[PDB]
Enzyme design. Structure first.
Site, mmCIF file in Angstrom:
data_model
loop_
_atom_site.group_PDB
_atom_site.id
_atom_site.type_symbol
_atom_site.label_atom_id
_atom_site.label_comp_id
_atom_site.label_asym_id
_atom_site.label_seq_id
_atom_site.Cartn_x
_atom_site.Cartn_y
_atom_site.Cartn_z
ATOM 1 N N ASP A 138 0.836 -1.196 0.000
ATOM 2 C CA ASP A 138 0.000 0.000 0.000
ATOM 3 C C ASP A 138 0.872 1.246 0.000
ATOM 4 O OD1 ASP A 138 -2.450 1.346 -0.128
ATOM 5 O OD2 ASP A 138 -2.505 1.579 2.068
ATOM 6 N N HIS A 145 -3.971 14.268 0.333
ATOM 7 C CA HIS A 145 -4.142 13.452 1.530
ATOM 8 C C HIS A 145 -2.976 13.639 2.493
ATOM 9 C CE1 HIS A 145 -5.369 10.068 4.020
ATOM 10 N NE2 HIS A 145 -4.121 9.641 3.961
ATOM 11 N N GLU A 211 -10.391 4.122 3.754
ATOM 12 C CA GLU A 211 -9.411 4.801 2.914
ATOM 13 C C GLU A 211 -9.785 4.476 1.481
ATOM 14 O OE1 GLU A 211 -5.646 5.840 5.607
ATOM 15 O OE2 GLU A 211 -5.295 4.328 4.066
ATOM 16 N N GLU A 213 -9.284 4.096 -2.168
ATOM 17 C CA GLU A 213 -8.098 3.831 -2.971
ATOM 18 C C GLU A 213 -8.476 3.026 -4.205
ATOM 19 O OE1 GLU A 213 -5.318 3.056 1.020
ATOM 20 O OE2 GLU A 213 -4.742 2.310 -0.964
ATOM 21 N N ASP A 245 -9.101 0.469 2.240
ATOM 22 C CA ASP A 245 -8.141 0.066 3.267
ATOM 23 C C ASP A 245 -8.665 0.528 4.623
ATOM 24 O OD1 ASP A 245 -5.924 -0.661 4.778
ATOM 25 O OD2 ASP A 245 -4.766 1.122 4.186
ATOM 26 N N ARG A 249 -7.886 4.312 13.390
ATOM 27 C CA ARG A 249 -6.878 5.364 13.490
ATOM 28 C C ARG A 249 -6.368 5.556 14.904
ATOM 29 N NH1 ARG A 249 -6.024 6.925 8.841
ATOM 30 N NH2 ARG A 249 -7.709 6.912 7.263
ATOM 31 N N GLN A 252 -3.939 3.025 15.375
ATOM 32 C CA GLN A 252 -2.749 3.327 14.579
ATOM 33 C C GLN A 252 -1.833 4.296 15.310
ATOM 34 O OE1 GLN A 252 -2.746 4.080 10.050
ATOM 35 N NE2 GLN A 252 -2.104 6.091 10.809
ATOM 36 N N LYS A 265 -4.439 -1.651 10.422
ATOM 37 C CA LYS A 265 -4.704 -1.821 9.001
ATOM 38 C C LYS A 265 -5.095 -3.228 8.606
ATOM 39 C CE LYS A 265 -3.255 2.144 7.171
ATOM 40 N NZ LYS A 265 -4.232 3.013 6.455
ATOM 41 N N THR A 269 -9.213 -5.432 4.562
ATOM 42 C CA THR A 269 -9.086 -4.584 3.392
ATOM 43 C C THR A 269 -10.034 -5.155 2.353
ATOM 44 O OG1 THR A 269 -6.770 -4.020 3.884
ATOM 45 C CG2 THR A 269 -7.546 -3.688 1.626
ATOM 46 N N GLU A 376 -10.237 13.057 6.937
ATOM 47 C CA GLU A 376 -10.119 14.334 6.237
ATOM 48 C C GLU A 376 -11.470 15.031 6.121
ATOM 49 O OE1 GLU A 376 -7.256 13.593 2.656
ATOM 50 O OE2 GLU A 376 -8.204 11.708 3.249
HETATM 51 MG MG LIG Z 1 -4.089 2.975 2.868
HETATM 52 NA NA NA Z 2 -7.192 -2.190 6.064
#
Ligand SMILES: [Mg+2]
Ligand code: NA
Ligand SMILES: [Mg+2]
Ligand code: NA
Lengths: 429, 426
Positions: A138, A145, A211, A213, A245, A249, A252, A265, A269, A376
């Site tokens: 990733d 971002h 996320e 993507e 993804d 947070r 994280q 993470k 996914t 965001e």
């Molecule tokens: Mg990601």
């Molecule tokens: Na993930």
């Protein structure tokens, strides 16, 4: 070559009428690959979406209307074996299929028996993970971002770390937890570091986020120790999927220094099930953003290497009848291209394999309604999002369904990606 | 049960006489699993090491002397066999230990079968023992993390290091079997005198002395493995060199962690030493302070007494220099704790997954697991006992990891995990 070009012609249409819907994802120009089974045949096999239906490639091969180099690569639980056949194979199949699905072709159109077998409604199908993923990587290649996120961690002036504009930074992801669209995602428990307490606590994640993507899928690998040049990179890419993804947070923040995101993470996914081929996307290639400073030589490439892919995300609370769109952006805004990402991935000698999945990083656009994460969109919860159908969101709540969608818009048609959806289950108690 | 305990008895001996060598790795008490081919049969199949030879399991199964639930012994990888679960592993172990016992004549005296089923390692080629679906690397040496941290702080350990076994996803695709040469990476380097990075050969190539454990039973996505159940998920262990390009790492790794600096190569030894064979060497892990969160706690002993040593031999040099001697028992976080934390947020694991311990550094200065620590980032280059000096690894150097469990007059050992460094592309 000329055959390949004919498959991109916007004027072509199919005798599968749903395929001619101007806003449908699966135009005759698309022809994406997936792995499906159905109620009549639970064996997983290779399928190609067309309109609201699916072409059974193994059935067309058995009938003699479709041939690949010579066990059938179309009767497999994953696309790997067929992808491994190489780009000449992908294009041969695409040209044969485009011909057979064309409104002016009678070979399959007028064979009611084979057509009744070889074409299946998506409404009757189970779509499975399209590839067996040997490795999932990733990246982090959206300037907006990295700016948005970095602004919260530092400030606008110091939003971007110096290495970010010198390389497409990235990390190894967890291949085992990549799941197909529709798989429920359970809110993770983990270690949380609260601002008041000295030591961390164990508890349910309180900042569950998406996320937005894309992921591209490797079609040709490279040997260990043998870098892929930037100019050669795209020839190694088979196609693209949508990729969510999922991120915890708060988990994280506490775990990630210095070895990176890990438990935050790897719990889930999600990817969409249809791999849209890189060839099908060729009509939507566009100029990538200007890079400043000019990257080191091994990352440079002439010409256009971005792709005009409209992306949207909807969020539907459990009690809601209709989903509310929470962002709209475009893949074309990424600062680092797929070619550059693969070039950097292998520049030190790392090998890649057919079926590898490479996530773009969170795709965030110029406007406040185009960011690729609730982090965001709500500025870490400072301005919660007001949902069009009702309700407010900071981060994802239990029973929320998150749906990624994407398409390339042409003149009177689309080349689209289907959906990448998941619904959140309460954390274990 | 009684059957399994008889395979651990230090008094047992083989008719394969080389297995009774007191300092050999492949005693009858070991019986590790691997993938081999030989000059007579290029097909990859499952083997078990005994002394200087290999037991061709598929040949015994065909001869009727071996049974399990196409044969899972005729595979390019141990995955399908391992997937049969721990009862099958112990069944095979008990049967093989009996067939190889000094007084059993069933295999010993069947020359037409023994000529086919006992293959000398010298006539055989060893391959990567499993198809690795995922590779995770941890960081669980307090001494290592301290020495590294001591290079940027006084507060050498970060707070979260003592609260969780931090780790990262590694690159499964570049795990190679012992003896595969490793090309020095080119990458981006941040030089002290220059504002922008340059592209060039890595200048700080290093080892990381680790072990790897291999998953024998996975867990469902969303379903954590409790610390108390973790070890029943573990099939066995290997030696693991996580080659590292430290100047490449320093520039790339904030904030997503090490990437290009690690994925160019990771070497493992070929023989998987089973957790059952390691049971006589279970010892008490280091005392942890503070006490971890409840999900990371376990009673009893969960460390393992494994002697580890690394040699370095310059190209065309006759003799290798031992540059470190340590032991797996010093790791601050155990395998059980690593697997519990790996899955506590719901991550799934699969048969054949590889889990690296992190660099194993001991308390003494001659037990650090990397040249970064042994030379203090080059400030004190080390003198090869055989002559010459090293800061980091130079082209042509051969780095060999070795290891064994020391019993009473016998060993249960791991073989070697070696690689020679090839020059960077130019
Ligand atoms: Mg990601
Ligand atoms: Na993930
Ligand atoms: Mg390591
Ligand atoms: Na490595």
């Amino acid at each position: 070559s000329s055959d390949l070009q004919a498959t991109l012609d916007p004027s072509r249409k199919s005798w599968v009428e749903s395929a001619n819907n101007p806003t449908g994802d699966f135009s005759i120009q698309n022809l994406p690959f997936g792995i499906f089974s159905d109620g009549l045949n639970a064996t997983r096999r290779v399928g190609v979406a067309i309109g609201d239906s699916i072409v059974d490639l193994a059935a067309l091969e058995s009938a003699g209307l479709l041939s690949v180099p010579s066990d059938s690569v179309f009767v497999r639980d994953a696309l790997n074996d067929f992808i491994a056949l190489g780009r000449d194979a992908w294009r041969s199949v695409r040209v044969q299929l485009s011909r057979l699905l064309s409104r002016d072709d009678a070979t399959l159109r007028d064979d009611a028996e084979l057509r009744g077998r070889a074409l299946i409604r998506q409404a009757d199908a189970q779509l499975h993970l399209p590839v067996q993923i040997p490795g999932y990587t990733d990246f982090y290649s959206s300037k907006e971002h990295a700016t948005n996120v970095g602004s919260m961690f530092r400030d606008p002036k110091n939003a971007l770390l110096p290495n970010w504009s010198e390389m497409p930074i990235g990390y190894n992801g967890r291949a085992s937890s990549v799941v197909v669209s529709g798989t429920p995602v359970r809110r993770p428990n983990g270690q949380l570091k609260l601002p008041d307490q000295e030591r961390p606590v164990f508890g349910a994640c309180r900042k569950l986020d998406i996320e937005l993507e894309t992921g591209f899928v490797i079609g040709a690998g490279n040997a260990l120790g043998e870098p892929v040049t930037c100019a050669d990179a795209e020839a190694h890419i088979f196609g693209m999927v949508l990729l969510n993804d999922w991120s915890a947070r708060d988990i994280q923040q506490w775990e990630y220094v210095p070895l990176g995101p890990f438990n935050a993470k790897t719990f889930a996914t999600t990817i969409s099930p249809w791999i849209v081929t890189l060839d099908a996307l060729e009509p939507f290639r566009v100029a990538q953003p200007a890079q400043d400073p000019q990257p080191l030589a091994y990352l440079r490439h002439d010409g256009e290497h971005a792709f005009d892919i409209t992306l949207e995300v909807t969020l539907r609370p459990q009690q809601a009848k209709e989903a509310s769109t929470i962002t709209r952006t475009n893949f074309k805004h990424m600062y680092w291209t797929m070619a550059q990402q693969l070039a950097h991935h292998t520049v030190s000698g790392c090998n890649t394999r057919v079926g590898d999945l490479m996530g773009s990083g969170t795709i965030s656009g110029p406007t406040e309604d185009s960011f690729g994460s609730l982090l965001e969109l709500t500025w870490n919860g400072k301005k919660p999002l007001e949902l069009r159908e009702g309700g407010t969101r900071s981060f994802i709540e239990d029973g929320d369904e998150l749906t990624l969608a994407g398409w390339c818009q042409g003149e009177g048609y689309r080349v689209g990606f289907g959906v990448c959806a998941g619904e959140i289950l309460p954390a274990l108690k």
